[PDB]
Structure 1
Amino acid sequence: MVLYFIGLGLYDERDITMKGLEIAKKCDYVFAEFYTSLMAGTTLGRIQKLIGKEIRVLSREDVELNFENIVLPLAKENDVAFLTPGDPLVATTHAELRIRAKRAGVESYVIHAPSIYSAVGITGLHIYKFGKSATVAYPEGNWFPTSYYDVIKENAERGLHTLLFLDIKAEKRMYMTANEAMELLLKVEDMKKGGVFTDDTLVVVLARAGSLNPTIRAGYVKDLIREDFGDPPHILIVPGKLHIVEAEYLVEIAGAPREILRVNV
């Protein structure tokens, strides 16, 4: 009579925590959603085999509209698990589901897993220096979202780094690349002209974090906008003011132009 929110991690089925695995193994029913992110190193089949349970995949509408009708009813008389890529409560609105659980008389527990939000530490940028985060959303017909541009401006003025989650259209299997994100940003720059994101802007790209060989690249937009960063998922970062130690790591590990070491004071 409980509901477990269990994260599966960054890239493959082994990114789940042992705590999460052992609990999932003992649940009666196991649901999951794969629309909030992309696990590029595994398959539903491999996950099912590891957990030894059939996984009932849910759509965004199934969750946001009918979570209390599909999952909670079973949780009232069984041990139920709801799996998600990465950490279940990071860059998702899943936290709200615990409220629905309580109002349904179902106790809930959360089991964390590696998240892209903290995994960006592998870029060498100090985690504490990351400011407000944003999501670069795909334009919808004539609707053109631009809120993320203002987030960068705000952080950059404070000397903070900006983490940019990239859009994903799971049902259409569309995963925004860092290239597409950069293209969108340059266009927003033309409209607002706030001098926030240009060809000379230094950016960092992290692709397939969690894999043994993720792509970690840093450089100016003009040089990376057409570079191949490999298969999705990707995240884009616009650094703020760099510490020499961050610059050194970017140069040594992310192949950044040695000129960034010569930080301006």
Structure 2
Amino acid sequence: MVLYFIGLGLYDERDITVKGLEIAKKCDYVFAEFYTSLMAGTTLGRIQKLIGKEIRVLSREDVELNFENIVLPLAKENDVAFLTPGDPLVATTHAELRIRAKRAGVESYVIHAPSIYSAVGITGLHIYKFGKSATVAYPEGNWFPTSYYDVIKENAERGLHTLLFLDIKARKRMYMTANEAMELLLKVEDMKKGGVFTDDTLVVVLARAGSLNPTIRAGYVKDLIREDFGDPPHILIVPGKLHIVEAEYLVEIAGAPREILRVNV
């Protein structure tokens, strides 16, 4: 009789909320997509085992083109659930799917889950200081994306931190690393020469957030660009002017250079 959008969280099958699980367990049909983000600490099997249902995985095309033909038809006579990594409506276009549900006469409900958007709090950077966000897109062909560069500039100019989602090619199983993101930005700087991103720029890397032992490292681009941050997914953050307490955390927890402790008020 209804459609539930249930988030699965950051890293493993246990990042789903209790609410999400109890509801998923009772649904008649369970669908899911795993292309918007990467859950590096679980497997389909482990999720199916936890939920106790067979999970039909949909591709980007299945959702974007046939969500109303594959999922919605069943939601009219049964309790159906649509699973996604992290939070279902964050950094995705899944919100529009609720409009499709409505027009098909299907009531929908949303069950949230931990999101990278807020998990960045673990980096010690004040969440309220994050500005506009952006995604570092893999260049393809003769098209070289640069919008994410402008976002960093605008935020930094206002003293705001910039969260950078990193590209992903689910089918090709290619997950952009922080290292690759840094390389691309240095290239954009050479083009625009805005002083936005250089070897001296302080940056923060968060890898496999959600895991019990995430990789959190802060430092200058010149020293981190070739560092190994472990398996994906990775997120890159270009901080704005730091509060002393932020700097203290980056140094004590993310092993940043003790010189950042001396902020230039």
TM over 0.5: yes
Secondary structure of the 1:172 match is coil
Paired with 1:60 and 1:228, the residues of 2 have a C-alpha distance of 30
Supply the distance in 1 between the matched residues of 2:112 and 2:257 (Cα, whole angstroms): 36
TM-score (normalizing by structure 1): 1.00
Q: How does 1:113-262 map to 2 (within 5 A)?
A: 113-262=113-262
Q: Where does the alignment leave 5 or more consecutive residues of structure 2 unmatched? A: none
What is the distance in 1 between the residues matched to 2:92 and 2:40?
Answer: 18
Indicate the larger mover: 135-144 or 44-53: 135-144
- In the other structure, the counterpart of 1:57 is 57
> CA RMSD of the aligned region, Å?
0.4
| CA–CA distance in structure 2, aligned partners of residues 61 and 140 of structure 1 | 20
Deviations along 1:3-34, one digit per CA (max 9) or x if unpaired, are: 00000000000000000000000000000000
1:142 deviates by 1.3
Q: Distance in 1 between matches of 2:142 and 2:78?
A: 46
Q: CA deviation at 1:140?
A: 1.3
How far does residue 237 in structure 1 lie from its aligned partner after superposition? 0.1
Looking at structure 2, the residues matched to 27 and 172 of structure 1 have their Cα atoms a distance apart, in angstroms, of 31
> Per-residue deviation at 1:188?
0.5
How far apart are the structure 2 equivalents of 1:144 and 1:106? 41
1:192, CA displacement in angstroms? 0.6
Secondary structure at the residue paired with 1:27? coil
- Cα-to-partner distance string for 1:207-254 (whole Å, 9 max, x where unaligned): 000001000000000000000000000000000010000000000000
- Identity among equivalent positions (%) equals 99
State the shift of 1:141 in Å. Answer: 1.4
Take 1:61 and 1:147, find their aligned partners in 2: how far apart are those partners? 26
Deviation at 1:110, TM superposition (A): 0.2
Q: Give 3-state SS (helix, strand or coil) of 2:181's partner.
A: helix
Q: How many residues align?
A: 265
Measure, in 1, the Cα distance between the counterparts of 2:173 and 2:22.
Answer: 31
- Bigger mean CA offset, 140-149 vs 93-102: 140-149
SS at structure 1 position matched to 2:235: strand
Counterparts of 2:41 and 2:98, CA distance in 1: 29
For residues 102-121 of structure 1, what are the structure 2 equivalents within 5 Å?
A: 102-121=102-121
SS in structure 2 at match of 1:171: coil
Q: CA deviation at 1:184?
A: 0.4
Q: Deviations over 1:75-95 (max 9, x none)?
A: 011100000000000000000
Report the CA distance between 1:45 and its aligned residue.
Answer: 0.3
CA offset digits 1:154-210 (Å, max 9, x no partner): 000000000000010000000000000000000000111111000000000000000
Q: Supply the distance in 2 between the matched residues of 1:63 and 1:188 (Cα, whole angstroms).
A: 33
The alpha-carbon deviation at position 262 of structure 1 amounts to 0.4
Cα deviation digits, residues 33-84 of structure 1 (max 9, x gap): 0000000000000000000000000000111111001000000111000000
CA distance in 1, matches of 2:171, 2:39: 14
Distance 2:180 2:81 in 1: 35
Q: Distance in 1 between matches of 2:247 and 2:53?
A: 46
Deviation sequence 1:75-123 (CA, Å, 0-9, x none): 0111000000000000000001000000000000000000000000000
Q: Secondary structure at the match of 2:189?
A: helix
| Gaps in structure 1 of 5+ consecutive residues | none
Alpha-carbon distance between aligned partners in 2 of 1:122 and 1:75, rounded to the nearest angstrom: 38
Q: How far apart are residue 144 of structure 1 and its match?
A: 1.0
Q: Secondary structure at the match of 1:92?
A: coil
- 1:143 Cα deviation after fit: 1.3
Q: What SS class does the counterpart of residue 142 from structure 2 fall into?
A: coil
